[PDB]
Design a protein around this motif. Structure first.
Motif, mmCIF file in Angstrom:
data_model
loop_
_atom_site.group_PDB
_atom_site.id
_atom_site.type_symbol
_atom_site.label_atom_id
_atom_site.label_comp_id
_atom_site.label_asym_id
_atom_site.label_seq_id
_atom_site.Cartn_x
_atom_site.Cartn_y
_atom_site.Cartn_z
ATOM 1 N N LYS A 1 -0.493 10.460 46.970
ATOM 2 C CA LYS A 1 0.248 10.641 45.723
ATOM 3 C C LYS A 1 1.593 9.953 45.895
ATOM 4 C CE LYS A 1 -1.662 13.870 42.695
ATOM 5 N NZ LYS A 1 -2.009 15.273 42.346
ATOM 6 N N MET A 2 1.777 8.827 45.223
ATOM 7 C CA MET A 2 2.883 7.919 45.494
ATOM 8 C C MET A 2 3.797 7.862 44.274
ATOM 9 S SD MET A 2 2.577 4.007 46.777
ATOM 10 C CE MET A 2 1.468 4.632 48.028
ATOM 11 N N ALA A 3 5.070 8.212 44.466
ATOM 12 C CA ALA A 3 6.061 8.130 43.406
ATOM 13 C C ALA A 3 6.692 6.746 43.404
ATOM 14 C CB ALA A 3 7.144 9.191 43.593
ATOM 15 N N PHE A 4 7.336 6.402 42.285
ATOM 16 C CA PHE A 4 8.145 5.195 42.257
ATOM 17 C C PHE A 4 9.421 5.406 43.066
ATOM 18 C CE2 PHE A 4 5.585 4.498 38.434
ATOM 19 C CZ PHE A 4 5.173 3.195 38.656
ATOM 20 N N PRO A 5 9.943 4.351 43.684
ATOM 21 C CA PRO A 5 11.257 4.456 44.330
ATOM 22 C C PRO A 5 12.268 4.946 43.304
ATOM 23 C CG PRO A 5 10.238 2.309 44.752
ATOM 24 C CD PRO A 5 9.417 2.978 43.692
ATOM 25 N N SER A 6 13.101 5.904 43.706
ATOM 26 C CA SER A 6 13.916 6.643 42.744
ATOM 27 C C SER A 6 15.337 6.124 42.609
ATOM 28 C CB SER A 6 13.962 8.127 43.121
ATOM 29 O OG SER A 6 14.469 8.295 44.432
ATOM 30 N N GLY A 7 15.702 5.071 43.351
ATOM 31 C CA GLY A 7 17.103 4.667 43.434
ATOM 32 C C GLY A 7 17.717 4.310 42.094
ATOM 33 N N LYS A 8 16.963 3.615 41.239
ATOM 34 C CA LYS A 8 17.509 3.240 39.937
ATOM 35 C C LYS A 8 17.831 4.460 39.086
ATOM 36 C CE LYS A 8 15.501 -1.370 39.634
ATOM 37 N NZ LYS A 8 15.488 -1.371 41.118
ATOM 38 N N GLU B 1 18.494 7.638 40.473
ATOM 39 C CA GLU B 1 19.548 8.375 41.172
ATOM 40 C C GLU B 1 20.929 7.974 40.688
ATOM 41 O OE1 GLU B 1 18.934 8.380 45.575
ATOM 42 O OE2 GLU B 1 16.866 7.813 45.089
ATOM 43 N N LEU C 1 12.234 12.995 39.376
ATOM 44 C CA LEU C 1 13.333 13.121 40.359
ATOM 45 C C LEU C 1 13.961 14.489 40.122
ATOM 46 C CD1 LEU C 1 15.149 11.880 42.508
ATOM 47 C CD2 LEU C 1 16.603 11.030 40.668
ATOM 48 N N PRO D 1 20.289 14.511 43.254
ATOM 49 C CA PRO D 1 18.837 14.461 43.455
ATOM 50 C C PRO D 1 18.400 15.210 44.704
ATOM 51 C CG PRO D 1 19.674 12.316 42.798
ATOM 52 C CD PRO D 1 20.878 13.167 43.118
ATOM 53 N N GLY E 1 14.554 15.663 45.336
ATOM 54 C CA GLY E 1 13.279 15.154 45.810
ATOM 55 C C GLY E 1 12.569 14.413 44.702
ATOM 56 N N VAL E 2 11.503 13.698 45.092
ATOM 57 C CA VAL E 2 10.696 12.897 44.175
ATOM 58 C C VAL E 2 9.216 13.223 44.348
ATOM 59 C CG1 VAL E 2 10.401 10.622 43.211
ATOM 60 C CG2 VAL E 2 12.350 11.081 44.678
ATOM 61 N N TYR E 3 8.489 13.317 43.232
ATOM 62 C CA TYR E 3 7.048 13.556 43.295
ATOM 63 C C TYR E 3 6.389 13.055 42.014
ATOM 64 C CZ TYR E 3 8.542 17.757 40.742
ATOM 65 O OH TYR E 3 9.129 18.629 39.857
ATOM 66 N N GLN E 4 5.063 12.890 42.082
ATOM 67 C CA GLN E 4 4.244 12.470 40.946
ATOM 68 C C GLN E 4 3.696 13.664 40.179
ATOM 69 O OE1 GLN E 4 4.938 9.232 40.361
ATOM 70 N NE2 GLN E 4 2.796 8.756 39.856
#
Ligand SMILES: COc1cccc2[nH]c(C(=O)N[C@@H](CC(C)C)C(=O)NN(Cc3ccc[nH]c3=O)C(=O)C(Cl)Cl)cc12
Ligand SMILES: COc1cccc2[nH]c(C(=O)N[C@@H](CC(C)C)C(=O)NN(Cc3ccc[nH]c3=O)C(=O)C(Cl)Cl)cc12
Lengths: 296, 296
Positions: free
Chosen positions: A5-12, A14, A110, A117, A119-122
């Motif tokens: 289960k892969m999330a998108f990189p969250s930096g943009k 954050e 996010l 922030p 954590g990140v998840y799908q």
């Protein structure tokens, strides 16, 4: 190889998260150009939000981006979201869109608290317009999104946890997904179904990754499959779903209705102690796009 | 409420990812201050890496941070990692540490390709020193990390996929986890075990979230539990594990050896069609810290 289960990189995203405090209530907001978007609950059993907003002044809103305080120079309400105009444009504003998603589609969340922030998840939008998230008190205003190239498509802002422990929110125009309202009340979602097209996509992911034990020589008809699908509370499969699974069917050489005969067998007989991609259940929160993105 | 496999926000790491190309080989590197760290395989069945590096010049290394090219002014090898000294310090360098982790501990992976982040997910270091990742060709140099406050603890750099589809890599000093080497060869990992203390932590997460059907009035001894544990290929449970689960035992009011009697029952009898936190299997990739972080 492998399937997660892969999330998108969250930096943009954050770089857009801020803290909004009004009186005793603190929650998260989304800072894009010179506007902060946040749940209107920040101004509070059944509020009259139009009255409450008229009684506010710009200086009642404390908005903090990290340490830096942003000064509110205007405010307005759009459905269940507040738009706070601030004196500073966010220099980290990515290319973005506000898009409303369909049941069965996935997005990254996010989780944010006090503007920071966590954590990140799908998540997937369920057919009853809830999401199976992970949210604690103070998570209001956390957002869900997808990324295409450099463009962030925001699709979700968090508002509510239902008594069953699932979650409800709005799009970024402030319109709720599903028959929910932003009030301190116990609210029930409708009945949910399993997202059939996603289960099939995930079975294709398994074949791509070397899990083949569930395949069989049989093919079924769309209607014979749906007769079995309705019995196990699966969404009826349509020809457009078949069309969408075409690329995965082409890559694996397994026709969609061939894979449907495998799913029918799994529904009637279970897995008999075996697993698929590390799961003992039929997983329905990967879209066909998610599989192609991750397997290619 | 809710319990998800939750990664750390990846933004601090995204700002450190670059592309390293040497000859025909391209992979990912980690740009911290004025050093780029990347797998030494970028300079290539059994290479003599010391010879290959002596034959390189600084100008053979093409390092790209987005569009901007970084010029290499020095290079050295540290075990299986190259350190490329560059003329520019990364202005987005976070506070960071290089920490080697223990089997049973978790971390977030930012899958990266051609220097561009693709997705984020959680992994655990298995007792056989592999990780169950999701990696395609070109993922070499992607890193795993944890975040404490503002400090990024880098623990993993990706090098290898095993024939079984699991993954192997090094710490950021270039020392492999486990008995693996960075060569184009088929390599087997040792036998793996289930991380018992993490299964118990996840059972506590379930109780915190309202899943109680697996509880029972029975308590067991540590040794009677381990007799059953060895039979199902579970790591022997130790008193330090019991101590680490203390905070979760205190929050739920369920003693650790009480929870062990539940796990023993689940191992002997299965779940009988029921699920725990949405899973039909006993999940072992959440640490006690992961549960406290997410449930509190
Ligand atoms: C009698 O009242 C109820 C009975 C049964 C169920 C209920 N639910 C709510 C609810 O959700 N309430 C909103 C505020 C409303 C006015 C929008 C809320 O607290 N939102 N969250 C998210 C949040 C909190 C905690 C855990 N999980 C979460 O996601 C914030 O952080 C802020 C009230 C309620
Ligand atoms: C006969 O050779 C073999 C037989 C059986 C198994 C084998 N494995 C490897 C291996 O892993 N090879 C390294 C290079 C070595 C020299 C470090 C590799 O290609 N690393 N990845 C990760 C990677 C690629 C593809 C999918 N998944 C992934 O994670 C890069 O991206 C770069 C060789 C090999």
């Amino acid at each position: 190889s492998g399937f997660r289960k892969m999330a998108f990189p969250s930096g943009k995203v954050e770089g857009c998260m801020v803290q909004v405090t009004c009186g005793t209530t603190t929650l998260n907001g989304l800072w894009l150009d010179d506007v902060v978007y946040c749940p209107r609950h920040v101004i509070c059993l059944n509020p009259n939000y139009e009255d409450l907003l008229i009684r506010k002044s710009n200086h009642n809103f404390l908005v903090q981006a990290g340490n830096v305080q942003l000064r509110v120079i205007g405010h307005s309400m759009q459905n269940c979201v507040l738009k706070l105009k601030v004196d500073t444009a966010n220099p980290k504003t990515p290319k973005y869109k506000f898009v409303r998603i369909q049941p069965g589609q996935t997005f990254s969340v996010l989780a944010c608290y006090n503007g920071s922030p966590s954590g990140v998840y799908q998540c997937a939008m369920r057919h009853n317009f809830t999401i199976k998230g992970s949210f604690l008190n103070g998570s209001c205003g956390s957002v869900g999104f997808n990324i295409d190239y450099d463009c962030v498509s925001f699709c979700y802002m968090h508002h509510m946890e239902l008594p069953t422990g699932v979650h409800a929110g709005t799009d970024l125009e402030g319109n709720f997904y599903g028959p929910f309202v932003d009030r301190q009340t116990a609210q029930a979602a409708g009945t949910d179904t399993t997202i059939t097209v996603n289960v099939l996509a995930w079975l294709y992911a398994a074949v791509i990754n070397g899990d083949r034990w569930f395949l069989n020589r049989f093919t079924t008809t769309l209607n014979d499959f749906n007769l079995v699908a309705m019995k196990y509370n699966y969404e009826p499969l349509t020809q457009d779903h078949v069309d969408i699974l075409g690329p995965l069917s082409a890559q694996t050489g397994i026709a969609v209705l061939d894979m449907c005969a495998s799913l029918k067998e799994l529904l009637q007989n279970g897995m008999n102690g075996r697993t698929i991609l590390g799961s003992a259940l039929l997983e329905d929160e990967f879209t066909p796009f998610d599989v192609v993105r991750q397997c290619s």
